[PDB]
């Protein structure tokens with residue numbers, strides 16, 4: 001959750 005706190009809304013910047 002440290003980085004992935006947008007699990008309920010994945011976006012482009014969150015590409016990994």
Ligand SMILES: [Zn+2]
Nearest residue numbers: 006011013014
């Ligand atoms: Zn994000």
